[PDB]
RNA sequence: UACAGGCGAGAGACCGAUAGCGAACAAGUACCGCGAGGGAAAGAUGAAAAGGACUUUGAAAAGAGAGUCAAAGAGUGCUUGAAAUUGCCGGGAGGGAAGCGGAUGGGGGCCGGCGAUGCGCCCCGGCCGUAUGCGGAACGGCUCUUGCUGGUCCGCCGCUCGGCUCGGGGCGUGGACUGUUGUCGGCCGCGCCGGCGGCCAAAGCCCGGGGGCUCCGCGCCCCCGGCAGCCGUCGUCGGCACGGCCGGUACCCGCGCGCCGAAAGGCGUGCCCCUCGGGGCACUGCGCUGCAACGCCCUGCGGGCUCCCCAUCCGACCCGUCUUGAAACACGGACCAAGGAGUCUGACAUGCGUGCGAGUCGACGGGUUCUGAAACCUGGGAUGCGCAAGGAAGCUGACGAGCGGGAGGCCCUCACGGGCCGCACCGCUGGCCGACCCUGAUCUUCUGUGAAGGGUUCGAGUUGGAGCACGCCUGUCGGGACCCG
RNA sequence: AACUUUAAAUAGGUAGGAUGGCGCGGCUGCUUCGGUGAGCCGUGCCAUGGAAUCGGGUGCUCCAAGUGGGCCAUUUUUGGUAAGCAGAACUGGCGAUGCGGGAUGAACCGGAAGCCGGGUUACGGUGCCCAACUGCGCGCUAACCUAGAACCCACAAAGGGU
RNA sequence: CAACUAGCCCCGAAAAUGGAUGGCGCUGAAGCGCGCGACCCACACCCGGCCAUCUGGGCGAGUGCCAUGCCCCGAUGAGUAGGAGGGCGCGGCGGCCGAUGCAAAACCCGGGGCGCGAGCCCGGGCGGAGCGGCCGUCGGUGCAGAUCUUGGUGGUAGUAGC
RNA sequence: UACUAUCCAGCGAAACCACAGCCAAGGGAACGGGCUUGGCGGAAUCAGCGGGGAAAGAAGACCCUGUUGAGCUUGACUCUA
RNA sequence: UGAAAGCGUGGCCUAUCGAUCCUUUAGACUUCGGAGUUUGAAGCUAGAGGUGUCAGAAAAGUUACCACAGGGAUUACUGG
RNA sequence: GCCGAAGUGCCGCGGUCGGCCGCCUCGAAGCUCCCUUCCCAACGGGCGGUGGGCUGAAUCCUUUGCAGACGACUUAAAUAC
RNA sequence: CGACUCUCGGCAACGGAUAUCUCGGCUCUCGCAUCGAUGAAGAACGUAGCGAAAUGCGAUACCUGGUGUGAAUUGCAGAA
């Protein structure tokens, strides 16, 4: 018909529950997510459902320094979000107790985190205290950074000039 | 439409660079020399990442010292030390720990920030002038 | 609900009946539909009388679709043990006996038919079986 | 440590007679070529030959009978016996007629299908019995030592009653594919009729007045004031009469629930306008979405499907390929069966999945065995966890970062918004490290040292890492490498 | 055209705000003979509010296929007598396009096409072919040296006729 | 009476296979110019029904289970090169279930039925020993061609001929 | 005038074939058996025939191109008996 | 240079030029690897010696004795 | 008797006979049983009943030469110029 | 109006596909060492009652001694 009419047709669609998803734990934990998002106000599990859907290797694993810098006094003690998962590389001791919940956890990260204080909750228990998702971040995780943005193949990607 | 030998990309990784452009390096040649027999590593392996289990790290054994403030050789804690003349290890995030450190390099000034007790000792071997004259004494520790 | 949407289905038909181009003179080529690859092909450019293309829009409704016309969704049974899955659905779902299962199986199939309520194509396709035109 | 020969063995997600080796069979045979060399075709009756005696026709080969066989629709053309072609015959069609071979419509020809025949009620015949007591148990909520409330069922006795099902009898309602007709609602067309206003309203006619033209006068014209009147065009509203199609409205579309009235239809009351005829306007909750009729379901027949004839139509010749364009006076293809071409690998990129994660990767190996396996395990080595140089090497890479937009959360506010924290991510400005260049304290084995302050230089860095292993698709390279030349 | 004082139209660029402005007060090796100024930081104030219109959403990143011979028409235009010619400029098509129209036609015209019923049109028609007024109205035409009859398009002129 | 203006008609206007407003024919046209109505009319447009795709919802509290389900939306859909998506068929392998000499597989069938299709299902006939479905796994995996390869068989043709 | 053809009895191929076979003009890969429009429109056929089927045989021998060869020549490049 | 403010990284502006290799030149730096010393050599950084088919193969003819893959993208020939 | 054509049909007469709401009656308008044209004319054919009548052609072998590729053409022979 | 031209079915003929078979191939893996002038590898031509072939053998010729097994060989004949 139009080509404007055609435009409306030729649309977004990047709205996919992932090509396989293989993990049946992960797949009945975003049925968790996706009939409580429908029955409550929380925008904030909505984003979680979108993060837990498309990808896995876009997930990011979250070291225990930076984590630990942006709740100093500032966010007093509340509950990470921790998207993929917690990894361990870093001795500080930390902050002294901090409630995290994850997707997943190092075998690593559940002795240390506890033994630092607070508890390694589950995602299955961030859904069922916290359906509202509030006094809650969606704490961080960096695959942007200085390795792997175009930095790939061989020799990087450059300064820009040539490449 | 296609015969691949044109679209599947020609045969072979040249016109890329022949007379084409784009990737790779350009302006090649620089230094030559050293051939088969002036070979291989010298490494460079950090202190931190043992700096964290410095202090569980009576594995590599204390003495006289504390359990916190522990002596332990670090060329025979790291994997594959072995083949190159000396491995100095740098202080990346932070180290809160009283351990110690035995090396034949050191990036020292590196144990200025962990100076609550740490033990920058120089390895004899790393001199190179000491008296092998059949007699005795220095060398290193070590592992694979 | 059910019972107009039966009548479009049977009464419009799209029964077109996707012929292969130049099946007719090739006896070779095949009845057996297959896309026209080549942009020189006229049913390709969709010209009419040229045999049409089969599309998703010739389809049917969504629920007359697998149904046999008496508006029994049809079921192919091998076993008595697939029978009893039957007897849940009783009108919905219709019993036909299989090619493979012989003379004598197929006569404890439709006398179990015949309790389930399920009788239609069962019973025609072993009297055929046993000796009957 | 090797092993495509030889000999003697064990196996395979091997192949299944155009395949597999050249050869399953007399195969390196037959045959081809002067030679070097080239090199096939070719497996299957049946359990057992029980491989058709005998009779008859025929010169014989054969045939026809018969015998034999579980089967000759198994007779050494031998299990099954496809396509093509050929024969016979039947059907359609027709010997006055034009062919892309089909689609579309109708008729013939051919054939399968079509609730077991439905429901309510009562009478007889038939069978069983609950409640409650008894007697034996799987159960429940739960508690969970333990406790209390709730079980149902079967055995089958007691004590009182009653019910159901198959068939028949007896009455009322009427259900069986499929085709047809009536209707309500929705959508759309259809012709026709009527009203008001716009366009100072005026054509118009009667009455009245003046002028011009004509100057031969009739007549013609023009204008102005009173008037039935009716007009072309613009806008709008109003009313009818019919039909097509689709659907029967399966949850708020529509509507009933007291009464009369065949019926449709109407029947409260207050209010207000009109104050006439009538009107508009207010006032309860539930339940719920198809109505009338005819044929027959079996006799019999609607129908479906194929060919044909007649009707109708794009018919660029049929497809593929090449090409801007293929019907092409481009190229290939008589027809059909069976082969027949993006594969597999090593090493790679991305994506996606899986594991584990500052690690990760068992399997070179060793242990062990139900044995090419599976299980177990070693130090690792490889890759990563820091880099940057050509190289020597590098105070030696740990002081540690802001800003703007940011999801989301937090706080306030009824909300709108405001404030707070701010991720992912993006952009930007710095510091730090190496290479490069400056700067060069205190010190010092005598030139080392590197505090300290910088730079239109440059890096696959740090400034708060992510990999590694395995796999799959697709891309990439070496390989015969999509197939063929 | 390779001249231009002059000088269009259609084209083309920029701006029309919260990615903004303003107040407060900080730093510098700059810049000022001078805190003078410049830039950049903290903090405060001002919303629909910066023409119109729209966003059956948009923004962003990675990776790979095919293509790498184009061809045509209207318009603009260079070479050439010209050409269904060779070569540009703009745009739409064909290629990747049937269907309807132009008798017929890859590109013109109309319109981009799911599957159907019913309605209604476009292009183009209404004597018959061929669905549809031998309808109404007002002219013109009498063609023995080619009557006339639908863009592209199937050609056609100077010049002549009491 | 003269010179003009511009309509149609006439001349200028001559080619070869016979011929083309497409044809017949048409003269108060069915011509030519023009007006006015009515009307005809594409896969276009509308309304309704319906398909998939995309978009937005919605409904799992278990104890009928596809929740990658089901149900409500509205808009959209040509399509070569090519991409991605979801399926179908065959052979063999691990699992699981079925079928059989009282007739398997195979093959035949102007016989029925299903699915948009890929294909599937079932009956009858032929036949005589093993086979198919479903869930995983894997390929020497699907044909119409290739001046295709190999086998069979036509028309040519009972003809050239001998 | 012989021997054929022809006609017979016997015997019996091949080439070749997308599907086939009546013209005219039109447009169109710009020269049609087929489409479009007109004209037409013998069953079933034999002997003939050389217009046509751009008939068949032969991936045009020419001509151009390919980063394709080979024969030859030499004052090519580069080596050498 | 000019009083200085200023101006000057060739020619008033628009053309007038050149990869890796290799050599050459400069830098007294690095390395020659069992340690030194010294010749010599090799590196890195910035120039020069140059490819005019000028983003940069190392190249002369003939073929009617011709061959092969293709082409009507293309000639000579018919038609338009 | 006419129309010669492509007359093959038309027109005139006279009874006989059917039909005639032409006119008048009877039971009756009901015989396709309460929408399903429900076939109804007659150009023609099929098929019986019965009253007549027609009493053969053609083709093969053979032959002629008038004629011929072969059919065919054109002659001849069955009881007689 | 037979016929012809065409089409299909049913039954066939044609043909050897398909299915189902397979004392075979194919490929991998394992064990094994072991030719000859002391006449080999390879060939030729003969020999079986009736044999063309394959297979076997060499004038001691489809075989011999010895040994194992313990009654067949077979198409027919035959020895007993």
Known sequence: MGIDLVA??????????????????????????????????????????????????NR????????????????????????????????IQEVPAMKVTALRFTETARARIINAGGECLTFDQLALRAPTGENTILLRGPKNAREAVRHFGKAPGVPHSHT | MTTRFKKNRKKRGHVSAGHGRIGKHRKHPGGRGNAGGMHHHRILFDKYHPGYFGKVGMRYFHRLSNRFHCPAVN??????????????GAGKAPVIDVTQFGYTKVLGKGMLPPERPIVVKAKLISKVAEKKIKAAGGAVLLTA | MAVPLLTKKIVKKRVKQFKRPHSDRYIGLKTSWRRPKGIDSRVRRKFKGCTLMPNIGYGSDKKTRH????????????????????MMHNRTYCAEIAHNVSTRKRKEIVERAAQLDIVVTNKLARLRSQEDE
Do not use: C, Q
Request: hydrophobic share 40%; aromatic share 8%; no cysteine.
């Open chain 1, 8 to 57: 409306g047709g030729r649309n977004k669609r990047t709205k996919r529950v992932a090509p396989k998803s293989d993990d049946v734990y992960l797949k009945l934990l975003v049925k968790l997510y996706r009939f409580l998002v429908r029955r409550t106000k929380s925008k904030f599990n909505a984003v979680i459902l979108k993060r837990l859907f498309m990808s896995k290797t």
């Open chain 1, 60 to 91: 990011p694993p979250l070291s225990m320094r930076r984590l630990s810098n942006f709740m100093k006094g500032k966010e007093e003690k509340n509950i990470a979000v921790v998207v993929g998962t917690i990894t361990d590389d870093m001795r």
């Open chain 3, 67 to 86: 149904y046999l016309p008496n508006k029994f969704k049809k079921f192919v049974v091998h076993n008595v043990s697939e029978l009893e899955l039957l």
């Open chain 2, 75 to 88: 060329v025979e804690r790291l994997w594959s030390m072995v083949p190159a003349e000396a491995g100095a």
